[PDB]
Design a protein around this ligand. Structure first.
Ligand code: H8H
Length: 287
């Protein structure tokens, strides 16, 4: 016998039965199989898979990430479901990827969010060369709007990277993938973890983290996409970047204005590093 799929939420609303057009609770196929139409595979890793699908419910498009294998235990389950809790903590914001719903069936977690344009990373590798700076500024601003929304709620993304920023057509963009998001001070179902080492803030090397870590992460995110360079995973080059230095190559082809802003974001000392609000308050970054 099989447990039925059940909604995963932390809002405290009723415990409720997942139902959908095309979904027969009798039939053995999963809720995701019956209630959706897999259109393409957006990605795959050890996290599982992301699918571009069309809901049989409202007929519209979404992205659904399903975990790869059943939960290994209670603790393993709690930490996976926490991603939903995080995403729900973000709430409604135009610069943040919106969560539609989530559910679990057979130890597998399904996360259904809005379908976005390609990630900044995908858009960058497709563009071939450096992005126009007018584009880059728009990317920098929308992510800062997203960060300020997170940071004003005591939330830290902790894994801001080009692959987490999605081109909102056009040419806006949204911050998503809240798997590592922590609410400062109430942590946590699971312990906090650093993000991608390529974009990691220097203070995390000694176990320190605040909202400032995101600002640094966004800095190297923008540096990567605007120079079309590739960031080191280690060594002196990596360590130079965390010491206020710039790659001796230097960001050539970048203006003074954009360079001076990145310096504010790439500041080694967290307490000196600019905040998102202060950055957005500059004038070179208004609407
Ligand atoms: C060849 N083209 C096909 C269409 N495509 C537009 C849509 O591109 C995406 C890709 C996503 O994820 C990929 C980005 C890097 O991470 C892995 C694959 C999207 C995405 N991912 C997602 C992530 Cl990262 C985290 C949690 C999720 C997610 O969906 C549901 O819950 N989410 C929303 N839209 C995506 C669109 C261009 C290229």
């Amino acid at each position: 016998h099989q447990l039925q799929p059940r909604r995963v939420s932390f809002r405290g609303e009723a415990s409720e039965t997942l139902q959908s057009p095309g979904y027969d609770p009798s039939r053995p196929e999963s809720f995701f199989q019956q209630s959706f139409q897999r259109l393409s595979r957006l990605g795959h890793g050890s996290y599982g898979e992301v699918f571009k699908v069309r809901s049989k419910e409202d007929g519209r498009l979404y992205a659904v990430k399903r975990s790869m294998s059943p939960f290994r235990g209670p603790k393993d389950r709690a930490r996976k479901l926490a991603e939903v809790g995080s995403h729900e903590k973000v709430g409604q914001h135009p610069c943040c990827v919106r969560l539609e719903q989530a559910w679990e069936e057979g130890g597998i977690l399904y996360l259904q969010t809005e379908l976005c344009g390609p990630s900044l990373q995908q858009h960058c590798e497709a563009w071939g060369a450096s992005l126009p700076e007018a584009q880059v500024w728009g990317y920098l601003r929308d992510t800062l709007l997203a960060l300020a929304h997170l940071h004003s709620q005591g939330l830290v993304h902790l894994d801001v990277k080009p692959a987490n920023i999605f081109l909102g057509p056009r040419g806006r963009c949204k911050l998503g993938d809240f798997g590592l998001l922590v609410e400062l001070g109430t942590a946590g179902a699971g312990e906090v973890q650093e993000g991608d080492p390529r974009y990691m803030a220097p203070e995390l090397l000694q176990g320190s983290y605040g909202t400032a870590a995101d600002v640094f992460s966004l800095g190297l995110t923008i540096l990567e996409v605007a120079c079309n360079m590739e960031l080191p995973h280690g060594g002196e080059g990596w360590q130079q970047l965390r010491q206020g230095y710039l790659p001796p190559e230097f960001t050539a082809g970048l203006s003074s204005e954009l360079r001076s802003v990145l310096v504010m974001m790439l500041e080694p000392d967290p307490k000196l590093r600019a905040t998102a609000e202060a950055l957005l308050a500059l004038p070179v970054l208004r609407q």
